[PDB]
Design a protein around this ligand. Structure first.
Ligand SMILES: CC(=O)N[C@H]1[C@H]([C@H](O)[C@H](O)CO)O[C@](O)(C(=O)O)C[C@@H]1O
Length: 309
């Protein structure tokens, strides 16, 4: 094709992210009259999300996914997106990114500093905790070996609840669970399904600890080369795909607990009051480390009403 473009992702071929990326690719091919074709590179073939963000910056990868929270790697205050229990729901995540001064500035910085254009934002699920033994209360987290991504906020979730985190690449998690190198992991339900972590975990606890969004990002090097009518095709397709992507996750969160029960998984509902209480010293450390910018981001986000209006 005139533009042979590439979209990399950590998620695999059985995932919501991949399905939505397929919809995106199909719409762009059709509405560009075949001028643009987008090929998909799942399961971290090109590296992880940190690596793929570097490839967008350099112009060697055209599209990828990232959470708003991932930008904490560059702007420490952006950890507010994944401080456990701070963002209440997806409604708040959306307004946090697009309708706060903090969020609007982050979008500008992604463009200026990091070579990426934000096309759309989707919901990617609320993280829960699976394990090889029941989590009936926060006491059961003590010493639990928990696989987490290489991200400060997930490491902190594990630390502050009393667990023992092992950070690793997403591709490595299944084997870690299967071999009992670790005792558990903490992705959203959709990923527990997609990766078939249910095959190698007997328990699921509704910790509801971190809310994931998902940004459709394009390399500025690629987006600048597309005539404006093709920029519009890509932007519109990303917005349409994001709506679909969100719906896949919303519907799954309704249906998946029953799916897991049918596969033999036991579901628990630990009291979350102590989980939330345990994060108070982490929020204080966040404010200590990130200073006024962090305090301000927190204030802006805490001001957002979570009820749709
Ligand atoms: C966009 C993207 O790659 N998201 C990935 C996230 C983020 O890397 C992490 O939450 C830090 O932001 O990690 C996983 O949940 C994980 O490894 O458990 C897999 C998921 O596909």
């Amino acid at each position: 094709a005139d533009y042979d473009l590439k979209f990399g992702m950590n998620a695999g071929t059985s995932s919501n992210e991949y399905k939505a990326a397929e919809m995106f690719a199909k719409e762009v091919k059709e509405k560009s009259q075949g001028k643009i074709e987008i090929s998909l590179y799942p399961s971290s073939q090109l590296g992880d999300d940190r690596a793929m963000l570097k490839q967008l910056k350099d112009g060697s990868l055209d599209f990828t996914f990232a959470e708003s929270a991932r930008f904490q790697l560059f702007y420490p205050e952006a950890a507010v997106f994944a401080l456990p229990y701070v963002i209440s729901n997806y409604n708040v995540a959306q307004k946090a990114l697009f309708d706060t001064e903090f969020g609007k500035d982050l979008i500008k910085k992604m463009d200026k500093d990091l070579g990426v254009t934000l096309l759309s934002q989707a919901y990617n699920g609320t993280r829960q905790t699976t394990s090889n033994r029941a989590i009936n209360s926060i006491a059961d987290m003590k010493g639990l070996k928990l696989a987490v991504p290489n991200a400060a906020t997930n490491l902190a979730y594990a630390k502050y609840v009393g667990a023992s985190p092992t950070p690793m690449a997403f591709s490595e998690v299944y084997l870690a669970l299967q071999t009992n190198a670790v005792d558990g992991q903490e992705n959203p339900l959709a990923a527990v399904q997609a990766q078939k972590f249910y095959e190698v975990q007997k328990f699921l606890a509704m910790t509801n600890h971190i809310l994931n969004d998902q940004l459709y990002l394009v390399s500025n090097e690629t987006y600048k080369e597309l005539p404006e009518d093709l920029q519009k095709v890509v932007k519109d397709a990303a917005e349409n795909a994001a709506k679909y992507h969100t719906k896949l996750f919303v519907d799954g969160e309704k249906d998946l607990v029953t799916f897991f029960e049918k596969q033999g998984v036991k579901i628990t509902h630990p009291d979350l009051v102590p989980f939330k209480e345990s994060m108070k010293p982490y929020y204080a450390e966040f404010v200590k480390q990130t200073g006024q910018k962090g305090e301000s981001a927190l204030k802006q986000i805490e001001a957002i009403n979570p009820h749709h209006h």
